[PDB]
Design a protein around this motif. Structure first.
Motif: not given
Ligand SMILES: [Mn+2]
Ligand SMILES: [Mn+2]
Ligand SMILES: [Mn+2]
Ligand SMILES: [Mn+2]
Ligand SMILES: [Mn+2]
Ligand SMILES: [Mn+2]
Ligand SMILES: [Mn+2]
Ligand SMILES: [Mn+2]
Lengths: 388, 388, 388, 388
Positions: B259, C145, C151-152, C190, D227, D230, D233, D264-266, D270, D274, D277, D316, D376, D380, D383
């Protein structure tokens, strides 16, 4: 079974290619600078036809008029001594810090006027030395961020600079044409006119489009993952292949400029097949960098391998197209039918033809194999010299 | 602080987008097929303006004339019931096995004539339903190997097919224009006219270039690693942005069709900034696939997020260009100077101007910072709503 | 000068390779389905050694126990009739819609238990048919997404599934080892364990690491732009090259699965050089798809070209390493010095050695050329059969 | 609504980052060199916690013992004056021409012993200044051609060098750990250990694996199209995230090293989600280059935007995970089920469970949507600060 170049093969080299001292983004030079006179003599011994130059490769930036004339005289003496020609020249609008935001599309207007004056001074020199093509690679025209460059205004400025150059050459009565060399990125985040298609499209908006063509480079189109022989076929179809830069590149990464034949070797085969079958008659120019691991011996070995690999691929593509069994496979795959008009009968006849629609048997046509893999294995066997 | 689309925002969707059943190269469908009538009603409830179609999305391949008329009648009833329009249509020349080597550039001449008749039948339908733009995506025009396709003959065949279509529309007196949609690969190894630049250049060789423009898609240019807003700026500069396909893509890999707003979100911001500041007034069309992980609830959530993300980015890019502190930064970075002619004084005046060369102080010009990073952080703060 | 495979060359093919009907994301099948018995007979005629299978290629999904036994009996008869072996098997955990979010790492726990039971049922069959290696390609393990997959936790679930499979095989006393096949994307946005390095690192956290190795595929590492021979050298260095998948790929794009030797031909040369010089003795397995342009004749021509190209490259890499002039160039480039320990004298001796630092002449060492370009042109001449 | 860093946020910068003079493969420096003392003071004013260095950034290559001590004294004075720490150091084994074929894996044995002595001298300095992590980026370890480097012998040499360094630190009793930083190419054609997975796998073959982890960099994994969150992670799952390098990169091309949040801002969102968290508590180190378009004002603006963008994304991602409506969507998508064991009941119980196979209803499980697109879009909206 040797493959020795002569001047008649039209192989040319930039001064900056064998002259690259090996400075990279992460390392100091590994080789001393070469005098242009020495590169001319060394290349003539290897069988090259000629050399090309940026202004600043030949005359050190900032040289007085007196030093200028002296650098030119020595160079002209080495060309007379060796019989080497200079078929192409170009301008350095990328090294000096003034060009950090571009030459023809820098945001500062004063820099844009300076870029044009520096260019015109070099067109006169190029004409004096006999070049027929003047290349422009706008390696600093672009941006790393979206607000820094309005691309519509930047294409206005790029059209204005190329139009002024075409006015200059026509006013002087010079017999010189321009060739724009595309590159998709590096050193800018994104470079304007990033591929052969973007440069062809842009030329059609210039005031005198017949003065401008493209100088595509193998590694640059492959930095966008594109098929280089297909982009050259489109440039030939448009009548705009004025010059070409040959080298090798391993996929999408920094611009490696490896010797020609390294990188994607099957694309090198299909490119030579196309240049020789379309009868391209311009220079076969190498824009490459001998890797910084090499000393001077490795420089000339690298430059000789450029020419060698071209002549080996030339022999293999000519054996491929001459083989009766290949000619039969091309007919089996309907390459002859691709060359015939789809509807020379005209539109009304096509609309009235029931065999094109109402009675066309789609299943029988769908079931016909194209026999492309047998054709491609013949092409493989020919490239590897493994004809059985 | 909500962002609700209405028909006046001109958001459109292909039937094949929300209708994708989720078959991929490695997996079966995860969703049942949707009736076109249902997608029309569902999209009208979400605030869309209209839908688009391939011939085969609306009328199942091989339908008799009687079934054809019936599929069209039901569709037209749902458009009347909802007020949805159909601004664009196109032809499927890629799914049926007959098209395995192309439609307009298949090696078999009979297939090429069939592809043109299938196209013309759909142009009449498109006109009947009110479409103003007819798209052509030649997804099967290309090759996996170098001998299978002579690209010069294939561009001859592609020019011949587009010229015949332009003859047809002019002969019928229809008010419909064509838009070619480029894609660099997939499903063919390499596809002809692989980028917006190649399609723009090709159009300039057609018999009536004014009938043809481009329909670029975000994810397709990014499959070649190119900057999508820069390619759209070039299409706008040429006057050829007839239609656009909006979606998202994470870099160079298979065509994901996520999207709009997913993928490269800063490129989505700069694209909306450019479309709204150049005043593009065509449809904002989404060519996307809700991921096959989703049920029907997830389909409509995905389609609604397309429109949402467009309207959020529209608000952020308008706040960016309206901020006085941004207007000041644009002047600090000389964007105003990029929009002024480099040499409205003309060539002779430039040659005579000593301040452009002989007395130009290159070191002082080189030392001027461009202030691009402060400008780009303002653009970042505006996108994230973090203005301090 | 022919290159005919025999069973002793250990060439193997998946049923799904010559059996691919040609359905792609944009098109219907162009070929009818092949009975596994027919592919066994056809491949044995071309000189293959054996075939491999997913569970669902051999026994249609959902078959009753009675149909299962019947499909197995017919298959076993064709292997007895031809002398073909089955050295590797694997599970389809990607086609059925239940696997749309993964098998071993699906978010739904019930699907994860089903994926393990479907796998174990196929390990028993594989053992019965004599396979020594069981491959796992987790093509649905990943995400489009960032919030959909922690992933852990997903690597916890992937370790748990592989540990349970290693418990099963050890409890049954089977002589079968596992090989994980990495792929960086497609069909997921991915995929987890996207390269050979990620799979090697993951194996070192399993309870019994000696049961697991990698099955790298040429085209998959090249979908990340990586050097395939370097990743195989690392897998050999770790002792984990259990199996390999051979094919070709043109750079970073969708997974093309072209016949072996297409794609990057110099990487194919250096891969064969490494497999034969390290003495890899597993199957030379082709995971390829004859292009959908082809009929059945083109399928078997494509499969035969896989084996042909391997044997041509084998001969050229053996001639390269046997040439005295190459052996001399390898010494000139110090490959012999790379194989000697840097400090077999030990740490204290290195610290006390003034010739390693205090008196090391860095300029003289820097000036030594590596002579890599002459070596690489010898490698080129050997590949093209152009030794002069 | 401001986002001001303090030393407690643990933001660090390399001397070489704000100190990059802007020399690129095509252009001269655009900025004068900065004294390390000045960068320390400027960064402390912006709120950084500390700086890192290569040996040669701090003490000019070839400095005598007397100049060495003087460069160190001035540096230590600026750290005392500002309270800045030095948590990481590394060695330059890439700039000097001696390293043109590598440091630890150069073919010349003498260079390999020199590389180890140069490294050990800098480990003692690093310990003296309080660093806890010593990074190794082997940017010259690799090749441009296949015969120049036998990768098995090169991994032997790389293991030998890292084992000797681990012997040294344990013998000295230092509390310092090593972190290898992968990069897939540039400046070599291909670099060894090209990704986080290859570096993790290699560490498991060292004599004392507990001393070594990874220092992944955002832009490097994205140069292979991978990615980044990933790969981090997986490094966290292995317990090997010792340090991290933050920056931005626009896809697969040369290493851009843009400020963090560009690119790549998204993926930046993420990644912060990670790190915060999982409770990563190492330095947040920026390895970036302010673009050469900038003057000194633009350097410090770029470095400040690194820290700003981190703190905006932190806010965010924390608002995202705290939102009850997100917690509900995570349950709707079965993220809670991904965290539960697939078979804590054990293997025999799984084999006996008819609900895992014989009576598992695959169609009902397949029909369940994953609801990933709604999740997702919540991510968005969070963010962009567009929560409605
Ligand atoms: Mn180049
Ligand atoms: Mn060039
Ligand atoms: Mn698409
Ligand atoms: Mn589209
Ligand atoms: Mn594959
Ligand atoms: Mn495979
Ligand atoms: Mn970097
Ligand atoms: Mn770094």
């Amino acid at each position: 079974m040797n493959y020795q170049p002569t001047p008649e093969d039209r192989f040319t080299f930039g001064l900056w290619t064998v002259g690259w001292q090996g400075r990279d983004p992460f390392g100091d030079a590994t080789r001393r600078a070469l005098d242009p006179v020495e590169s001319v003599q060394r290349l003539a011994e290897l069988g090259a036809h000629g050399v090309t130059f940026h202004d600043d490769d030949l005359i050190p930036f900032g040289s007085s008029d007196s030093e200028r004339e002296e650098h030119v005289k020595r160079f002209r003496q080495a060309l007379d001594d060796t019989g080497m020609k200079v078929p192409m020249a170009t301008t350095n609008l990328f090294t000096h810090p003034v060009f950090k935001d571009g030459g023809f599309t820098a945001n500062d207007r004063d820099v844009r006027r300076y870029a044009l004056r520096k260019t015109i001074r070099n067109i006169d020199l190029a004409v004096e030395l006999g070049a027929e093509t003047y290349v422009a690679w706008g390696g600093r025209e672009g941006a790393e961020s979206g607000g820094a460059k309005d691309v519509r205004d930047a294409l206005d400025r790029m059209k204005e600079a190329f139009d002024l150059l075409g006015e200059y050459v026509t006013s002087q009565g010079y017999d010189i044409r321009f060739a724009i060399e595309p590159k998709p990125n590096e050193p800018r985040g994104d470079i304007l006119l990033p591929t052969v298609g973007h440069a062809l499209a842009f030329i059609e908006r210039l005031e005198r489009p017949e003065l401008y063509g493209v100088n595509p480079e193998v590694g640059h189109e492959q930095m966008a993952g594109l098929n280089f022989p297909h982009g050259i076929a489109q440039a030939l179809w448009a009548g705009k292949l004025f010059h070409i830069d040959l080298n090798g590149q391993n996929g999408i990464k920094y611009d490696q400029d490896l010797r020609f034949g390294a990188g994607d070797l099957r694309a090198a085969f299909w490119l030579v097949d196309l240049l020789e079958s379309a009868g391209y008659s311009g220079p076969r120019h190498f824009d490459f960098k001998p890797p910084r691991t090499e000393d001077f011996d490795g420089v000339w070995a690298s430059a000789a391998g450029c020419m060698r690999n071209y002549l080996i691929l030339k022999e293999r593509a000519a054996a491929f197209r001459a083989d009766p069994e290949v000619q039969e496979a091309l007919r089996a795959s309907r390459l002859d039918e691709l060359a015939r008009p789809t509807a020379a009968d005209g539109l009304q006849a096509l609309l009235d033809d029931r065999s094109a629609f109402e009675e066309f048997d789609v299943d029988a046509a769908a079931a016909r194999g194209m026999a492309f893999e047998r054709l491609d294995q013949l092409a493989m066997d020919h490239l590897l010299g493994a004809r059985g």
